[PDB]
């Protein structure tokens, strides 16, 4: 879904 | 980590 989407985005985010 | 962030990035692309 989007929303598992977004929060792999969020997850390579909290990872730089 | 780097593998896990990679493999996250790939996993989006592939889903969009």
Redesign the interface.
């Known amino acids: 879904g989007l929303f598992?989407?977004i929060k792999?985005?969020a997850?390579?985010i909290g990872?730089l």
């Open positions: 598992d989407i792999k985005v997850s390579v990872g």
